[PDB]
Design an enzyme around this catalytic site. Structure first.
Site, PDB file in Angstrom:
ATOM      1  N   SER A 402     -76.942  20.937  57.301  1.00  0.00           N
ATOM      2  CA  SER A 402     -76.388  21.863  58.291  1.00  0.00           C
ATOM      3  C   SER A 402     -77.460  22.680  58.976  1.00  0.00           C
ATOM      4  CB  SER A 402     -75.402  22.832  57.668  1.00  0.00           C
ATOM      5  OG  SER A 402     -76.025  23.596  56.666  1.00  0.00           O
ATOM      6  N   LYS A 445     -69.454  31.430  54.830  1.00  0.00           N
ATOM      7  CA  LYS A 445     -70.422  31.629  55.888  1.00  0.00           C
ATOM      8  C   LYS A 445     -69.965  32.706  56.845  1.00  0.00           C
ATOM      9  CE  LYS A 445     -72.938  27.299  56.175  1.00  0.00           C
ATOM     10  NZ  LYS A 445     -73.439  26.282  57.148  1.00  0.00           N
TER      11      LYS A 445
END
Ligand SMILES: Nc1ncnc2c1ncn2[C@@H]1O[C@H](COP(=O)(O)OP(=O)(O)OP(=O)(O)O)[C@@H](O)[C@H]1O
Ligand SMILES: Nc1ncnc2c1ncn2[C@@H]1O[C@H](COP(=O)(O)OP(=O)(O)O)[C@@H](O)[C@H]1O
Ligand SMILES: [Mg+2]
Lengths: 495, 55, 110, 165, 110
Positions: A402, A445
């Site tokens: 990511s 996140k």
């Protein structure tokens, strides 16, 4: 032999045979019994409402099994105990982490001098109900390095068809435990063995946010500890603001443990300052807070406002919570040692990466320099200079790829010298042409990004379904830009 | 499959219909794999939520 | 049906997980009417479990197969050994080399 | 230094490091980044100097530090090279520590207590420490702090502005 | 029933102390456990739990004997090897080293 037989008959007789704990069936009752005893976590609440509704609707009482998983200290174990109190069946729990032999789960052969029936049989001997709410915990780090997995015995325990007639060693009898309600806890799903992982429903407890973390602090922590230490509300008032300061500085974590312990020390030092102290009524005040905790354990929020060329804020879904790792890259050698030569400037990757992240980084490099020549043929900064690169360690391995999106934005930024816009996260993978890809674990996140004052989050467009599942307040402030093709990121990132 | 789960949860066909278009929609959108297992999870989920919606 | 007496056999199933491979076996057992009894062996490494022990050790018990025969009280059940592919194979003694002494069609008779 | 400095006056070839000291891996990581930041600071600071850009260089960092604390020593190296780079004896009895980043932003390191008590008897007088670790320096017993001067910083470019007036 | 079947050690401590509120001191807890039975810690936890120990009952004497007034304590070199179920029942306190200018003060005084 007479003594072993004494133990054996006593064990076999003690086991309940048809004893059935009664089961409350007031939806209106369990609703309040849960909501007033725990904050948030609507989904687990809703699920247990589902369970009760199924059993009451489906005639006779039934057992089940489930699997919570989440960051430590999030209340996982206390909700379980509360739920056991709510459902009216008896409670029990036991650790499983790090054990190798099954004998504790399996007793012993009872010809041995030290044999005793396995612990679940002890729980039956104490929990008179034949359908207790067993609570195995932290299965994800069960000890399994020794030869012969206990996890096979664990799957022998869970699977209902042979749950009906499970067979312990100390006494040789099949034993139904379908009525029993197992529950299990894990900080990350992947470590649990697949055959067992596929057998069970999953649930994810999430990290609490400061605003709500406060309200739980001032409903269940402060009153609880105050009753624990014997102080009364007449003695130890704590304005919410000092709790805010405790949160802002003295604790920085998604859980509710360190704040718990520090509040405990504060209350404790207050009580000590009552048993002999002049004051008979403590009133902590922010100035006064130092006296109980000393100087702050945190002061910075983020490591600094970003340097324009060569750093970028990066969300990452580390094993414990979210985090804001920064990717950092730099020049490695004078650029123009030979303007006319042709030997492309090598990368230097760092950060103790596993191999998959390394190739992902190289791929990102290739796409970056591709795009750079693609839309800016004249530039050459990235084709003719060595560069060294660093993505700090900590991310859960699945999240490693990511970083790539940020990584691209790193080089190009340095390639341009343009500052990135302030406090603007992004994440996700890339696919060598700028198409961006879905990534997991968005919740933590977004949590941490909210915690760091980010305002202008940028995400794969595809995964929007989850971002709209967030609580209405969590969305406040943040300005999501859904996107799929990285060329968009080049637009928004550099207006 | 569906009747089995329906008997598993006590509901009867009169109580929880499942029009076929919804079923094809699930298999085509909400879960993809050669195995049916995950689809079995989905169908039970809808049923059990339906049961709560009844009770 | 052409030759009277019952016969045994070994078989293998393979494909992606969750095709019903386990459950259909039970359906077969209910069809032919043999007894059913599942038994996973994923990762097993105690070969003695399949063959008991010397009977002079304390704590010895006869291997699994006799335990299931004791359960089914019938000469000709239908065992369902499962996930043989994942059988433990390490330095401690691989059971899979002992399975051949069961699985071999001719020699299982003794 | 390890080879003559003008063996290729126009050569485009790196001043390769040769680290020694029975290093672990994480120290290699920290060492490499320190090498790069040194090279960067020098290009930003004394552009004309290129002693580090083109000079193969042996380096020795003695083993003995607790391995988790091993990156903490990086900052010392960062001046080591610079001293040799710019030809300047390092200033007397001026120990320093703390982990650093690619921008020269020092980072907190643990075990300050053991570090302070050991350096105290070495005659050091002007320690410099991360400002981000400074509170722990206001928790040690006062007698330990008496004597030695202390500094506190966040960006290493300040440290370079202390050690070499 | 065993020859010389004296009650376990704590009862001897109760004898030596001749009072119901001793400062019992468990010691070197860190490396207990992993016996032939796995561990006796469960029974120790039964001791630790006030409602269970309130009528603690040794094999040697039929009478349960309350010990609520005992002030149990624990020690271990580090708080990692202790089995968890007991660990949560107790609190932990880090112990530091000694200053060289104070280690002498001990050296002189004791
Ligand atoms: N929603 C909640 N309601 C009440 N208490 C909470 C909640 N969340 C966290 N806690 C507090 O957190 C502390 C520990 O929580 P719990 O043990 O349930 O966390 P946990 O995730 O089980 O931790 P671990 O699994 O790592 O033990 C408890 O003292 C509990 O009071
Ligand atoms: N043709 C089929 N008929 C009935 N059920 C099926 C079929 N294919 C898959 N299933 C379902 O797949 C699930 C998995 O079955 P099982 O055979 O127990 O697992 P495995 O797939 O590991 O062999 C069962 O719930 C079963 O109903
Ligand atoms: Mg817990």
């Amino acid at each position: 032999e007479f003594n072993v037989t004494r133990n054996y008959l006593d064990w076999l007789t003690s086991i309940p045979w048809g004893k059935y704990s009664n089961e409350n069936l007031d939806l209106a009752r369990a609703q309040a019994v849960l909501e007033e005893d725990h904050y948030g976590m609507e989904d687990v609440k809703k699920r247990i409402l589902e369970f009760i509704a199924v059993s009451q609707l489906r005639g006779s009482t039934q057992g089940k099994i489930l699997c919570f998983y989440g960051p430590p200290g999030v209340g996982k174990t206390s909700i379980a105990r509360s739920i056991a109190r709510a459902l009216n069946r008896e409670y029990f729990r036991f650790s499983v982490g790090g054990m190798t032999d099954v004998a504790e789960i399996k007793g012993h052969r009872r010809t041995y001098v030290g044999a005793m029936p396995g612990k679940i049989i002890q729980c039956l001997k104490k929990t008179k109900t034949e359908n207790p709410l067993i609570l195995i915990d932290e299965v994800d780090k069960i000890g399994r390095g020794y030869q012969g997995d206990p996890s096979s015995a664990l799957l022998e325990l869970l699977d209902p068809e042979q749950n009906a007639n499970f067979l312990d060693h100390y006494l040789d009898v099949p034993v139904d435990l379908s009525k029993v309600l197992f529950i299990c806890t894990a900080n990350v799903t992947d470590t649990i063995p697949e055959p067992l992982r596929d057998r069970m429903e999953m649930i994810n407890v999430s990290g609490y946010v400061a605003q709500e973390k406060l309200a739980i602090a001032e409903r269940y922590l402060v009153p609880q500890a105050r009753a624990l230490c014997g102080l009364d509300e007449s003695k130890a008032k704590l304005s919410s603001d000092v709790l805010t300061l405790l949160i802002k500085q003295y604790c920085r974590e998604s859980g509710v443990r360190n704040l718990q312990k520090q509040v405990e020390k504060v209350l404790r030092k207050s009580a000590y300052k009552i048993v002999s102290g002049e004051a008979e009524s403590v009133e902590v005040t922010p100035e006064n807070l130092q006296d109980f905790v000393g100087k702050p354990v945190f002061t910075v929020e983020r490591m600094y406002d970003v340097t324009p060329p060569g750093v970028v804020m990066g969300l990452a879904w580390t094993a414990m919570g979210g985090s804001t790792l920064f990717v950092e890259t730099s020049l490695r050698r004078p650029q123009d040692k030979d303007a006319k030569g042709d030997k492309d400037g090598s990368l230097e990757v760092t950060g103790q990466l596993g191999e998959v992240m390394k190739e992902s980084a190289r791929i990102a490099y290739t796409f970056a320099r591709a795009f750079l020549m693609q839309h800016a043929p004249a530039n050459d900064y990235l084709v003719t200079s060595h560069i060294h690169l660093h993505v700090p360690e900590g991310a859960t391995p699945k999240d490693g790829p990511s970083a790539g999106c940020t990584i691209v934005t790193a080089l190009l930024s340095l390639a341009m010298g343009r500052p990135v816009r302030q406090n603007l996260a992004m994440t996700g993978e890339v696919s060598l042409t700028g198409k961006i890809l879905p990534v997991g674990g968005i919740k933590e996140k977004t949590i941490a990004a909210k915690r760091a004052g980010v305002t202008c989050i940028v995400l794969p467009a595809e995964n929007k379904k989850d971002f709209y599942d967030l609580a209405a307040f969590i969305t406040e402030g943040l300005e999501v830009h859904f996107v799929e093709h990285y060329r968009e990121i080049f637009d928004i990132a550099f207006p």
